[PDB]
Amino acid sequence: FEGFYKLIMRRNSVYVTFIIAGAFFGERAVDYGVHKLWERNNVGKRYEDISVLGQRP
Amino acid sequence: FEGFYKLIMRRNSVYVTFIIAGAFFGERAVDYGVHKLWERNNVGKRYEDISVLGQRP
Amino acid sequence: IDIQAAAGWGIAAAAGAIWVVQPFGWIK
Amino acid sequence: TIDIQAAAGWGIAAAAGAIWVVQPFGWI
Amino acid sequence: PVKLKAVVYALSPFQQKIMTGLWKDLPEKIHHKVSENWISATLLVTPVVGTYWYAQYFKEQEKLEHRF
Amino acid sequence: QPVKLKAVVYALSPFQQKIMTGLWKDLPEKIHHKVSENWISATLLVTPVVGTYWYAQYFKEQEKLEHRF
Amino acid sequence: ADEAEHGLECPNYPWPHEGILSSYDHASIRRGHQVYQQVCASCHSMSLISYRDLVGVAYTEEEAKAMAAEIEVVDGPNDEGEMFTRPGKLSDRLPEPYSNESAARFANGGAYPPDLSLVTKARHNGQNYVFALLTGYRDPPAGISIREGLHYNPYFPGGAIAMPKMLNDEAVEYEDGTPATEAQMGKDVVSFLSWAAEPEMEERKLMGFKWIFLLSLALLQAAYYRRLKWSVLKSRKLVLDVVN
Amino acid sequence: ADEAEHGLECPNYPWPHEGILSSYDHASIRRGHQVYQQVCASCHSMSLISYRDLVGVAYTEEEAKAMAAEIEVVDGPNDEGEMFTRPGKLSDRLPEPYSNESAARFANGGAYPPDLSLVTKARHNGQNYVFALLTGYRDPPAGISIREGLHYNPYFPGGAIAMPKMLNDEAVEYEDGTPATEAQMGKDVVSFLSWAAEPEMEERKLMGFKWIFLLSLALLQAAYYRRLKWSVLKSRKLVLDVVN
Numbered sequence: 091f092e093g094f095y096k097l098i099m100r101r102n103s104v105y106v107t108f109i110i111a112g113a114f115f116g117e118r119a120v121d122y123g124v125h126k127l128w129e130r131n132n133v134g135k136r137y138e139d140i141s142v143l144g145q146r147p
Numbered sequence: 148f149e150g151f152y153k154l155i156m157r158r159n160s161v162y163v164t165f166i167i168a169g170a171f172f173g174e175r176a177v178d179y180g181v182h183k184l185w186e187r188n189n190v191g192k193r194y195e196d197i198s199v200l201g202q203r204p
Numbered sequence: 205i206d207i208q209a210a211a212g213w214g215i216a217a218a219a220g221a222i223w224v225v226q227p228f229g230w231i232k
Numbered sequence: 233t234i235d236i237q238a239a240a241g242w243g244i245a246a247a248a249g250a251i252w253v254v255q256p257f258g259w260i
Numbered sequence: 261p262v263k264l265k266a267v268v269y270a271l272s273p274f275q276q277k278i279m280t281g282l283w284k285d286l287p288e289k290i291h292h293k294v295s296e297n298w299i300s301a302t303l304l305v306t307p308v309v310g311t312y313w314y315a316q317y318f319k320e321q322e323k324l325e326h327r328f
Numbered sequence: 329q330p331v332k333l334k335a336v337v338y339a340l341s342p343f344q345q346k347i348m349t350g351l352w353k354d355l356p357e358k359i360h361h362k363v364s365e366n367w368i369s370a371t372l373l374v375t376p377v378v379g380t381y382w383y384a385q386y387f388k389e390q391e392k393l394e395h396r397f
Numbered sequence: 398a399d400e401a402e403h404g405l406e407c408p409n410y411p412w413p414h415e416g417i418l419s420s421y422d423h424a425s426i427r428r429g430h431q432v433y434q435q436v437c438a439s440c441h442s443m444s445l446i447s448y449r450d451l452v453g454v455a456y457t458e459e460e461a462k463a464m465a466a467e468i469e470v471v472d473g474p475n476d477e478g479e480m481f482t483r484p485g486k487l488s489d490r491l492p493e494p495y496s497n498e499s500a501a502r503f504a505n506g507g508a509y510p511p512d513l514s515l516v517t518k519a520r521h522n523g524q525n526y527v528f529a530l531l532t533g534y535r536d537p538p539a540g541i542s543i544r545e546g547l548h549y550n551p552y553f554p555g556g557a558i559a560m561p562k563m564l565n566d567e568a569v570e571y572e573d574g575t576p577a578t579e580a581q582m583g584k585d586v587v588s589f590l591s592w593a594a595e596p597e598m599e600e601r602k603l604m605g606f607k608w609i610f611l612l613s614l615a616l617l618q619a620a621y622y623r624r625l626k627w628s629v630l631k632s633r634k635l636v637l638d639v640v641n
Numbered sequence: 642a643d644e645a646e647h648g649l650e651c652p653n654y655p656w657p658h659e660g661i662l663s664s665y666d667h668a669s670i671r672r673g674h675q676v677y678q679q680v681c682a683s684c685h686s687m688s689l690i691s692y693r694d695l696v697g698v699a700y701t702e703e704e705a706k707a708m709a710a711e712i713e714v715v716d717g718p719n720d721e722g723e724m725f726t727r728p729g730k731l732s733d734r735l736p737e738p739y740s741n742e743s744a745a746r747f748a749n750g751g752a753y754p755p756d757l758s759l760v761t762k763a764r765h766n767g768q769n770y771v772f773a774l775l776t777g778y779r780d781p782p783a784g785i786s787i788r789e790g791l792h793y794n795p796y797f798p799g800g801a802i803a804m805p806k807m808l809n810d811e812a813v814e815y816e817d818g819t820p821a822t823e824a825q826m827g828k829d830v831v832s833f834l835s836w837a838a839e840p841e842m843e844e845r846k847l848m849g850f851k852w853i854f855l856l857s858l859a860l861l862q863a864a865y866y867r868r869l870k871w872s873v874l875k876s877r878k879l880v881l882d883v884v885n
C-alpha cells in the first residue's frame with residue numbers, strides 16, 4: 091500500500107514503471123472484455139459453431 | 148577590348164543576350180567541328196558506307 | 205540518488221522491454 | 233525614360249533565351 | 261517590449277475544481293450562442309437547404325412529366 | 329567575440345594586375361619546395377602499398393610454380 | 398427516360414454482419430461457397446481468393462486440402478521443359494472458368510462476367526444490390542421488349558442483363574439440410590461474397606470498439622489536463638487603470 | 642584446380658570501335674548479325690534486341706521489315722479467345738530458340754546457353770574474351786581428360802565447355818563476298834554483339850568529346866575568374882607591429 095504509493099509519487103522511474111504496467115494490464119483487460127461481449131453478441135455464428143464442420147463429402 | 152565594351156557590356160540586358168547568343172552559336176560550332184573530326188576519323192565505317200545496303204534478298 | 209536512480213531506470217527499461225516485446229513463452 | 237529601355241532590353245533577352253532553350257527552327 | 265502596468269492575482273491549479281465549470285451557467289451559454297449566432301446560422305443553412313429542396317422538386321417534376 | 333586589431337593593409341585593384349602569369353613563375357622552385365618538404369610523407373604513403381603488392385605477386389608466382397608438375 | 402438508365406433501387410436488408418459489433422454467419426459463408434462452387438464458378442472467377450483463405454472460416458485444413466486436390470492446376474516447366482498438371486494445393490487460387498477475357502465474352506454472348514472477389518465492395522449498396530439482382534428476375538413492364546439473348550432485371554442498369562437466372566429452387570444440395578430455396582441460396586451466396594470482399598471485417602471491428610473506448614477515455618483525460626493547466630490563467634483577477 | 646579454374650586470359654585485340662573518336666564498323670555489324678542469325682540463334686536468345694534496332698545501323702527499314710516478316714510471332718487472343726500466329730514486325734524482339742530455360746538445358750545436355758544481348762558487358766574483358774573463346778577450341782594439355790558431351794576450351798573457366806566448336810570455316814556465306822574464315826566470322830560476330838550490348842556508344846563518345854572540351858575551356862575561365870577575384874587579397878601588403 092503506502093510503500094508503492096510513496097515510491098510512485100516520489101521517483102519518476104517508479105511512476106514510469108507504473109504507467110507501463112497500467113498500459114499493459116488495461117489494454118489486455120479491455121481486449122478481453124471487448125472479445126467476451128463480441129462472443130455474447132454473435133452466438134452460433136462462429137466458425138466452430140458450424141454443425142457440418144469436418145464433413146465436406 | 149574597350150570598343151566592344153561600349154556596345155555589349157554597357158547594359159546587363161545586352162550582355163545577357165550576348166551570353167545567350169554565344170552559348171547558342173558556340174555550341175553549334177563545337178558540335179559541327181566534333182562531327183567533322185568524327186567523320187574524318189571513321190572513313191568507310193558508317194551505315195551509309197555498307198556496300199550491299201538495300202541489297203538483302 | 206545515483207545508484208537507486210540507476211536501479212529504478214533499469215527496472216523501468218526492463219519492464220518497457222517486456223511490454224513492447226511480449227515474449228510470453230520464452231521463459232523456458 | 234530608362235525603365236522602358238530596360239524593359240525592351242530584357243524582353244529581347246527573354247526572347248533570345250526562349251529561342252535558345254526550345255529551338256523551334258523545324259516549327260517556324 | 262510594451263510598457264505594462266497591472267496587478268495579477270492567481271490561484272494554484274491544485275486549489276480549484278477543474279471540470280464543474282463545463283456545466284455551470286448552462287442556460288446563459290446556450291442563450292448567448294443562439295442569440296449571437298442565429299443570423300450566421302441562417303445565412304449558412306438557408307441557401308444549401310433551399311437549393312437542395314429545389315433540385316429535388318425539379319427532379320420529381322421532370323420525372324413525372326416524362327411518364328405516360 | 330570580436331578581435332581588436334591594429335594593422336595597415338594596402339591593396340591594388342584586380343584590374344591593375346596580371347592574373348595568370350604567376351602560375352608558371354619560378355616553377356622549378358615550386359617543384360623543389362613540394363619535393364623537399366613532402367618526400368617523407370610520399371615515402372610513407374607509397375612504400376607500404378608497393379611493397380605489399382610486390383610481395384603478394386611474388387607469393388602468388390612461387391605458389392603457382394610449386395603446384396606445377 | 399433516365400429511370401431505366403439508373404435501374405430500380407435495391408432495398409435494405411438486415412444482413413447478420415451489419416452492426417458495429419456483428420460478425421459474419423460462418424455457416425452461411427460455407428453454404429454460399431457451396432453455392433458458388435456449383436453455380437457461380439461455371440462462368441465467374443474469384444481470382445483474389447485461395448483455398449487457404451477458407452481454412453478457419455468455413456472449412457478445416459483437411460477439407461480445403463481435399464477440395465484443392467480435386468482440381469487440376471497448370472504447373473511447370475519440368476526438367477524437360479514441358480508444362481504439366483497436378484492436383485491443387487492450399488496456396489492455389491480458385492480456378493478460372495475461362496482462359497482469358499475474350500474467351501469469356503465469346504461463351505457469354507459478348508458480355509464478360511466480372512470477377513466476384515470484390516463485387517460487394519465494387520457496387521453501391523453492394524450486398525443489398527447483389528441480393529436484389531439475384532432474386533429480381535421478373536417480367537418487364539408493359540411496353541418494354543427485351544432483345545434476344547438478354548433478360549429483364551429492373552435492378553440492373555438499363556434493365557437488360559446478359560446473365561440468365563440461375564438461382565432456382567433446389568439448385569444446390571446443402572450438407573446441413575437447410576432447404577435450398579431461391580432466397581436462402583441468394584442470402585448465403587451474398588454472405589460468402591461479402592466475406593470474400595472484406596475478409597478483415599471482424600478483426601477490424603474488434604479493433605474499432607477497443608480503440609474508440611480507449612481514445613474516448615484519453616479524450617476525457619486530455620480535457621482534464623488542459624483545464625488543469627489553464628485554470629491558473631482563467632481564474633486570474635486582472636487589475637488595470639483603464640475604464641473605456 | 643589452380644590455373645584451369647580461372648582459365649586462360651584473353652589477349653587484347655585492336656577492335657575498330659576502340660578509341661575516343663572511334664565508331665563501330667557497321668558493315669562488320671551486318672556481317673556479324675548474319676553470322677548470329679545463321680549459327681548462334683538456333684541456341685542463344687537475344688531478348689533485348691528488336692528488329693527496329695537494326696534500322697539505320699545495319700539494315701534499311703524495308704530490309705528489317707522483310708526480315709521480321711520472315712518469322713512467325715504468337716499473338717492474341719482473338720475475338721473468339723484463341724492464340725494465333727502473325728508475321729513479325731519491326732517492333733518484335735528477336736525470336737527465342739527455346740520455350741523456357743528448362744527446354745534449353747534439356748536440349749544442351751543440362752547447360753543453358755546464356756542470352757547474348759549483354760554478354761560483352763557481362764564478362765571481364767568481354768569482347769576479347771568472346772573472340773578468344775570462339776576461336777580458342779583446341780586439344781587439351783597432356784594429362785587432362787574431358788568427359789563426353791564437353792569440349793576443351795582453355796579460355797572457359799575450368800576448361801570444359803558444353804558449347805561445341807561452331808565457328809568452323811565457311812560456316813556462313815557473306816553478302817559482300819567477304820571470305821568467311823573462322824577468325825573473320827569471330828571478329829564480325831563480336832562486333833555485332835558489342836553493338837548489341839552498347840548501342841548508344843557512338844552518341845556517348847560524341848557527347849563526351851564535345852562536353853569535355855567545353856568543360857576544359859570552362860575550367861580555364863573559372864581559374865581566371867577565381868584568381869581575378871582573389872588577386873586583391875593575394876597581392877595585399879600587410880603591416881603589423883609584431884616581430885617574434
Ligand SMILES: CCCCCCCCCCCCCCCCCC(=O)O[C@@H](COC(=O)CCCCCCCCCCCCCCC)COP(=O)(O)OCC[N+](C)(C)C
Pocket residue numbers: 169170172173174177345346347348349350855858859861862865
Ligand atoms: C564574336 C566576338 C567573340 C565572341 C566570344 C567572346 C568570348 C571569347 C572567349 C575568350 C577568348 C579570349 C580568351 C583570352 C585570350 C587571352 C589569352 C591570354 O593571354 O591569357 C590571359 C588569361 O586568359 C585566360 O585565362 C583564358 C580564359 C579563356 C576562357 C575560355 C574561353 C571560352 C571560349 C568560348 C567559345 C564559345 C564555345 C563554347 C560555347 C558553349 C592572360 O591573362 P593575364 O595573366 O592577366 O595577362 C598576361 C599579360 N599578357 C597579356 C601580356 C600576356
Ligand SMILES: CCCCCCCCCCCCCCCCCC(=O)O[C@@H](COC(=O)CCCCCCCCCCCCCCC)COP(=O)(O)OC[C@H](O)CO
Pocket residue numbers: 658659660661662849850851853854857858
Ligand atoms: C585535372 C583536370 C580536372 C580534373 C579532371 C581529371 C582528369 C585526370 C584523369 C583522371 C582519371 C580519369 C579516369 C581514369 C580511368 C579511365 C581509363 C579507363 O578506365 O579506360 C577507358 C578509356 O579511358 C579513356 O578513353 C580516356 C578518355 C579521356 C577523355 C579524353 C578526350 C578529350 C576530349 C576533349 C579534349 C580536351 C582538350 C582540352 C584542351 C584545353 C575505357 O577504355 P575502353 O577500351 O573500354 O573503350 C575505348 C574508348 O576509347 C573509351 O570509351
Ligand code: HEM
Pocket residue numbers: 436437439440441505508509510511516520527530531557558559560561563564586
Ligand atoms: C449464382 C451465381 C452467380 C452470381 C452470384 C452472379 C453474380 C453476378 C453479378 C453480381 C453480376 C454483375 C451485375 C452488375 O454488373 O452489376 C453478374 C454479371 C454476369 N453474370 Fe453472373 N452470377 C452468377 C452466375 C452466373 C452464371 C452461371 C453465368 C453464366 C451462365 C453468369 C453470367 C454473368 C454474365 C454474363 C454477367 C454479365 C451481365 C451483363 O453485363 O449484362 N453468372 N453476375
Ligand code: HEM
Pocket residue numbers: 676680681683684685749752753754755757760764771775797801802803804805807808830
Ligand atoms: C557463333 C555462334 C555462337 C556464339 C558466338 C556463342 C556465344 C556464346 C557465349 C559468349 C557463351 C558464354 C560462355 C561463358 O559463359 O563464358 C556461350 C555458351 C554456351 N553456348 Fe553458345 N554461342 C554460339 C553458338 C552456340 C551453339 C550453336 C550452341 C549449341 C549447339 C551453343 C551452346 C552453348 C552452351 C550450351 C553454352 C554454355 C556452355 C557451358 O556453360 O558449359 N552455342 N556461347
